[PDB]
Amino acid sequence: MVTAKKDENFSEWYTQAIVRSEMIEYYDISGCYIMRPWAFHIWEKVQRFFDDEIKKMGVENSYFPMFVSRHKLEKSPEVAWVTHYGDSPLPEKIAIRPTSETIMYPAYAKWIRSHRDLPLKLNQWCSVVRWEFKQPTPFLRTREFLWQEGHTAHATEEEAWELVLDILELYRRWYEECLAVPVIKGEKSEGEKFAGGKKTTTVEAFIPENGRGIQAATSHLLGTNFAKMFEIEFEDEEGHKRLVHQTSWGCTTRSLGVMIMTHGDDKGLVIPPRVASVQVVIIPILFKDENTGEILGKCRELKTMLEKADIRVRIDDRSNYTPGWKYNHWEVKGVPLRLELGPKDLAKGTARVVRRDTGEAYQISWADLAPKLLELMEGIQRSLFEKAKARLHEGIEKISTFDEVMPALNRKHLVLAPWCEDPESEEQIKKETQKLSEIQATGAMKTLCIPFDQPPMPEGTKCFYTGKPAKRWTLWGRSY
């Protein structure tokens, strides 16, 4: 049972939702959490979608070591260092991977020798470790987390940039098509991009209850800098030695946290049908032996028919729990549809179906069950996305001048503002907004992204902070 209200104390609500639904368990090492099966099911679904999609692009999976030698990593950072095997010291300490550039690119330098070898497109599913001192949040910001990382090498910059954009569109689909979470595609600012690359692109999500943006996934154009550092070169069709043009990209189980925060309500989780391991739960109403074998035989009959429409169905015929307990259990876990079958329903040839997202109840004849449920699930998925998109739209304010910023931040909104893109000004804006928030008593505003979808920039439009010529419309807000 969830008792905290989402719109009152959001942090207590989130903790309740993910504990009481059995998504997470705590662990004695700070910043690490156990991912229980109810959460892991969702990860498996988005992993299958993304993996299928990158394979059609020619990306192949691989597995590189979890350890990197001190002198290879440092070609200290907040990495976990292994210094001993048993009681014996290693002659050189080794780190646990925070990301695998230093592990993979020496191999790329060995494998790439001619244009015949390109493009090289690899991905791996693994976990990484970033041992930060700060407060962790389950799914969103943890010390160890699951994440794929893709790394590619190309003969030209244009082919690399094309892949960057293709991958970022896959991340838009991971969020919007699977998880029903709306995201904004954009470029990172110069101060916010990956330092080892040329251009970083991102999908950004918005959490209306605390007003914060959160980076959902990222796709980098690395250019040739790592090719220089690692000596990744190839002979072109005319004999000349050239540097490769690289990309890298990743997305994590943070996606699940964003889903939970987007669609959850006062009763617990709400799982979008496309990633629900159980789409429909059938609950036999058993009491005083009122037509028991009748009811359970019928439930089995219904499961088989729905499955023949590829609906993912679970009968909760466990005998150790009451029907009321089952209603609340599957509601807190977010199953899209609950189908109730009792003696009355069997006498009438119908089932009672309740939608998780809106609570609406439907009396459906057995014959109609499969097509109707399909309609409902399409309806649920679509409505989850559309409601979320409306909230995203209501949470962004277009502004012209800096004087509008603090009122907007106080409404827990993001701002879209014309910006000159000077890196000094982003540093100044972060400092000023933090100071102002402090005085009104994590308050800094930073750039979230420069969106791909740019409204026109009228000639003569001035930067909202510096008064210099504005270049592009930029999304700002408080953030994770």
Ligand X SMILES: O=C(C[C@H]1NCCC[C@@H]1O)Cn1cnc2cc(Br)c(Cl)cc2c1=O
Shortest reach from residue 154's CB to ligand X, in Å? 16
125 binds ligand JE6 (CB under 6 A): no
Shortest reach from residue 443's CB to ligand JE6, in Å? 18
The interface partner of residue 249, options being ligand JE6, a copy of itself, ligand X, none and the CB cut-off 5 to 8 Å by kind, is ligand X
94 binds a copy of itself (CB under 8 A): yes
Total chain residues near ligand X (CB under 6 A): 12
Place of tokens 């050239």: 242
Of 138 and 418, the one with the shorter C-beta distance to ligand JE6 is 138
Question: What is the four-CA torsion angle of 417, 423, 429, 435, rounded to 10 degrees?
Answer: 160
Of 6 and 143, the one with the shorter C-beta distance to ligand JE6 is 143
Shortest reach from residue 143's CB to ligand JE6, in Å? 5
Among 49, 81, 147, 327, binds ligand JE6 (CB under 6 A): 147
Shortest reach from residue 255's CB to ligand JE6, in Å? 8
252 binds ligand JE6 (CB under 6 A): yes
Q: Do 449 and 186 meet the contact criterion of CB atoms below 8 Å apart? A: yes
Helix, strand, or coil (residue 310):
coil
Among 12, 15, 115, 374, binds a copy of itself (CB under 8 A): 115
- Identify residue 99 by its one-letter amino acid code: T
List the one residue out of 171, 191, 190, 194 whose CA is nearest residue 181: 171
For ligand X, the binding residues in 171-230 under the rule CB under 6 A are: 194, 218
> Do strands 313-315 and 245-252 pair parallel, antiparallel, or not at all (unpaired)?
unpaired
The interface partner of residue 217, options being ligand JE6, ligand X, a copy of itself, none and the CB cut-off 5 to 8 Å by kind, is ligand JE6
Q: In angstroms, rounded to a whole number, what is the distance separating the alpha carbons of residues 376 and 233? A: 54
Among 146, 243, 296, 436, binds a copy of itself (CB under 8 A): 146
Judged by CB under 6 A, the stretch of 66-74, 216-224, 239-247, 265-273 that binds ligand JE6 is 216-224
217 binds ligand JE6 (CB under 6 A): yes
Place of tokens 């599913």: 125
Q: In angstroms, rounded to a whole number, what is the distance separating the alpha carbons of residues 5 and 236? A: 62
Among 39, 42, 79, 311, binds ligand X (CB under 6 A): 79
46 binds ligand JE6 (CB under 6 A): no
The interface partner of residue 82, options being a copy of itself, ligand JE6, ligand X, none and the CB cut-off 5 to 8 Å by kind, is a copy of itself
Helix, strand, or coil (residue 189):
coil
Among 31, 197, 223, 451, binds ligand JE6 (CB under 6 A): 31
DSSP string, 342-358: -HHHHHHTEEEEEETTT
Place of tokens 């990209």: 249
State the SS3 of 192-257.
CCCCCCCEEEEEEEEECCCCEEEEEEEEEEEECHHHHHHCCEEECCCCCEEECEEEEEEEECHHHH
For ligand JE6, the binding residues in 420-479 under the rule CB under 6 A are: none
Binding mask 336-365 for ligand JE6 (x = CB under 6 A): ------------------------------
Shortest reach from residue 299's CB to a copy of itself, in Å? 17
For ligand JE6, the binding residues in 196-215 under the rule CB under 6 A are: 215
Of 135 and 319, the one with the shorter C-beta distance to ligand X is 135
Check whether 233 is labelled as a binding-site residue: no
Task: Give the N- to C-terminal CA distance of the chain in Å, as an integer.
Answer: 28
Question: Between the CA of residue 433 and those of 29, 135, 192, 377, what are the distances in Å?
Answer: 35, 22, 17, 43
Q: Do 288 and 255 meet the contact criterion of CB atoms below 8 Å apart? A: no
For ligand X, the binding residues in 239-258 under the rule CB under 6 A are: 248-250
Question: At a CB cut-off of 8 Å and minimum separation 6, what does 361 contact?
Answer: 352, 353, 354, 355
Of 132 and 231, the one with the shorter C-beta distance to ligand JE6 is 132
Check whether 162 is labelled as a binding-site residue: yes
The interface partner of residue 414, options being a copy of itself, ligand JE6, ligand X, none and the CB cut-off 5 to 8 Å by kind, is none
Quick one: 245 exposed, middle or buried, by C-beta within 10 A (0-12, 13-18, 19+)?
A: buried
Q: Do 204 and 183 meet the contact criterion of CB atoms below 8 Å apart? A: yes
Q: In angstroms, rounded to a whole number, what is the distance separating the alpha carbons of residues 4 and 10? A: 8
Question: At a CB cut-off of 8 Å and minimum separation 6, what does 169 contact?
Answer: 185
The interface partner of residue 146, options being a copy of itself, ligand X, ligand JE6, none and the CB cut-off 5 to 8 Å by kind, is a copy of itself
Binding-site positions for Ca(2+) read: 162, 166
Contact residues for a copy of itself, defined by CB under 8 A: 25, 27-29, 32-37, 40-41, 43-44, 60-69, 72, 76-87, 93-94, 96, 107, 110-111, 115-116, 122, 126-127, 129, 131, 144, 146, 318, 320-321
Which residues sit at the interface with ligand JE6, rule CB under 6 A?
31, 130, 132, 134, 136, 140-143, 145, 147, 215-218, 250-254
